[PDB]
Design a protein around this ligand. Sequence first.
Ligand code: CLA
Ligand code: HEC
Ligand code: HTG
Ligand code: CA
Lengths: 243, 56, 137, 97
Amino acid sequence: TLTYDDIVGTGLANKCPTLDDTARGAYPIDSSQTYRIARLCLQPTTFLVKEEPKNKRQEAEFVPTKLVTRETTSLDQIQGELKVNSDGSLTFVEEDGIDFQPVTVQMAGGERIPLLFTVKNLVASTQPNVTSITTSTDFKGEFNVPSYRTANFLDPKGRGLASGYDSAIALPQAKEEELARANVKRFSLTKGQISLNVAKVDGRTGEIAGTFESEQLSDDDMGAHEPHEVKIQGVFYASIEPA
Amino acid sequence: EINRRVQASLASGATLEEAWSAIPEKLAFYDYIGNNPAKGGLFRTGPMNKGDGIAQ
Amino acid sequence: AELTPEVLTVPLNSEGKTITLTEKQYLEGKRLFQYACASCHVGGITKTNPSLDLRTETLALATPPRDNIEGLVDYMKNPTTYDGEQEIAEVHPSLRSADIFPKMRNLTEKDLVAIAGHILVEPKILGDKWGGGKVYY
Amino acid sequence: ELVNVVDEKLGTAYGEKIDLNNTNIAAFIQYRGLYPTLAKLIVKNAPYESVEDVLNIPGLTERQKQILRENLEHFTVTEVETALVEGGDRYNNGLYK
Ligand code: CLA
Ligand code: HEC
Ligand SMILES: CCCCCCCS[C@@H]1O[C@H](CO)[C@@H](O)[C@H](O)[C@H]1O
Ligand SMILES: [Ca+2]
């Protein structure tokens, strides 16, 4: 098969595995066995940002953006328990993995939108009575979105939350209040929402693949400005295992 | 000098509020680095009031 | 100031016994510490794990206590984590893993005592600078 | 009004004692017997409703429990502060020497 030296520099390392067109099977679930997802992979194909209109009577649309951070976007090696619930629904509870990527996209006109693309602490569920995972199975869930920068991050004048100056030291006698938003760093933690639509299943292997769409807030630069709403779409792949 | 006057005031009975209330504003104002002439810049133009402000 | 007999007098064991080192042992200790240890512990710090330093107070709170000759000699034979729970000979040089840490192969018992002696004497000279890292350069 | 949550935390018991819910793991080196084995376990099994709850960590040897007991006067608990616990910062908070 393909080794690192086959793949290095091709772009494939950012691509989730695909399933053949024959993968249309059913993966049976025994409510007596415990399972895990041994590998969840999410490859974004589109980032959309919701425009923010001047009057809030206009309907705000999600608009296309251009990716400027290259092929560094995919979430992978995610794993966690796949619980079988009382009512036969399945629940994925993320425990670990490469489960975030900082991403920057650009609006028409050049506005750059950094976001922490993520499914940290994902708890996603199916509809009830899932005796088998099929191309009709879906997962819907919620996850956490912590600040895009972590607490040590210092702005360009040295100011920070867990480190840094607490004032604008270049303006030794300016008034503080107008600068409070810039000087007092804050750490956001918000919720995002995701849906995974299975489209392929290899029952013989436990592998599934399909499409996903999530929604989360973008970088608020440690409280300095209002984040935007992002909509991420792409393909996914998962390997389920008895465990 | 401000410390001397405050110590004298006190030595002679004053409360701490009185002793400090006795210090002329003009003397206090000299004891402020915004008036030190070695605190400027070559391209920082105009009156001192244009930096820290007009003292009230 | 001088490197005197008082400066060179250090705890031998956990029970309060001291030992006075000769100036020659001190120098030996400094030399052998450079030869075998300073690549990671230059200045009393630890390059590959900065949480742990060679300060006397730190050594005293290790398990077993390492703030004395005997403790240090034993460390150099059979190093443990700081809580004494684990034997780390496989990734920390010692007489026990002289096969994989070849500079350990010709260290004699007397050499180990000299190094222990260096580690206990330096902070008596350098104070907080020992184990202080760059703040104190 | 906007507040720096870390500075605020320095006003609570987090500023006085090792906080089992927030404090970076290297702080456990300050007492005999805690680091690395108990420190790893304390951080992995956080948060705790009270200091005593640290004794209920599954799998502890008897001397482990005894070391915990001897060090409870040095511990505290406050609410998980997101800014202290995100980014694996309990494991490596970007401070070395
Ligand atoms: C000894 C001369 C002197 C001094 C010490 C002052 C001092 C002062 N003036 Mg007066 N002034 C002067 C002459 C002077 N002035 C003259 C000749 C005029 C008529 C132009 C004025 C008109 C004037 C006005 C209208 C005002 C002042 C004000 C002030 C105050 C602020 C100064 C400032 O911001 O400078 C800043 C100075 C600089 C930024 C220049 C620095 C040096 C330059 C860069 C040299 C250029 C180098 C050159 C390119 C080299 C090339 C050679 C080649 C071969 C390489 C201060 C008390 C201000 C105020 O507060 O008044 C109440 C104000 O409004 N001044
Ligand atoms: C890097 C490759 C090292 C060399 C060379 C030496 N030591 Fe070391 N030391 C190293 C690490 C990563 C650690 C921490 C290990 C752990 O997981 O706990 C240490 C620790 C020590 C200690 C314990 C410190 C304490 O405060 O209790 C001592 C006493 C010590 N090291 C001494 C020592 C001596 C004498 C060496 C020369 C023969 C030596 N070290 C080499 C990394 C490295
Ligand atoms: C509670 C977590 C804090 C960890 C312990 C503080 C280490 S900070 C400590 O400050 C001292 C200054 O005199 C020095 O002795 C030392 O070199 C320095 O690192
Ligand atoms: Ca489907």
